[PDB]
Amino acid sequence: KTASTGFAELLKDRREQVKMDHAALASLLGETPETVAAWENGEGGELTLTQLGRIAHVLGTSIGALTPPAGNDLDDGVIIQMPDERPILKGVRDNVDYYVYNCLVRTKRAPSLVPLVVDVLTDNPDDAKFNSGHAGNEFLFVLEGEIHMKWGDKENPKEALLPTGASMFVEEHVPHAFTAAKGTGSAKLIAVNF
Template sequence: MAIDIGGKIKELRVGKNLTLKDLSEKVNLSIGFLSQLERGLTNVAVDSLEKIAEALEVDLSYFFSIPKSSNNSILRSYQQEIFQVVNSQFINYHLTNDLENKKMVPRLVQILPCSTDENVTNYGHEGEEFVYVLEGILTLFLDNEKYELYPGDSVHIDSTVPHNWANYTNKLVKLLAVNTPNHFNIKHK
């Protein structure tokens, strides 16, 4: 994955006529580190990648790919790729090889710890949502109520009900989330 991210960074940097030195000054990372990153020789922390994305004027999710369609129904754990990082806090992995041909979207979500001072905005959207907590304590906001869900707890809701999630602990929260409809689906839209 480091090679893909590094290649995308280099492509954007060169396309904007920036030198490694220019990018280094914008993101406060060393030229040597950026060079190694572009060549796929090192990994980058999400917060540093977010600075790079901002400097190159792209969304952080630009650096992560959607799994390619495959006739294979099995997705091995080592084949899982990060699909999206939201607010440097929610890391989403798709759990399917064939997302474009399915009606639901199964994801593994990792939620990094955050401060309880942050305001959480509840929102509703089309479809259904199922969440199963694998690890950690998930704070669930559901229709103006606040709940703590523990490993083994689950919730299945109509997604139009205002809701959101947070991690107010000092440990990672992992959950399985399955949503409908599949907005990546071309056939079933």
């Protein structure tokens, strides 16, 4: 259920794994055995980030190992997003819009999944500003218009024109950027990070 119940269970598991009783762990943390027992009873909700770091350190592990997974936001395995629900960020430079990021469905059961419908408002490939590469892989599909894609080394990019209906895979960590094809107005693509 909660961060605190998750932590209570996982803390007890780890403490037992390294064969410490409450007193042994407490002696490493500037607490009483009673307080450690309280954490395992679900009373750790007010522990700070700093405190959690020290707990993980003395237990030879990470805060992540002591906290629950993201959770389950699915309806028997599925989640649906209607179009009007989409979060929207505008990619703006000096009060001029270059991209509109229309956010599609996401889920705590697969946190790396970030699908977007991207409206590409610049058709000047000079405006392409390289990112530093994504943490995960990405699948792209051109919905409207024509895309001018650049990738690799921002000072020596590989480039390609993608017509409507083209699809593309970009591996994790590969820097890239795109605009609409020179003079062609606007384009639209779906980008699925995963």
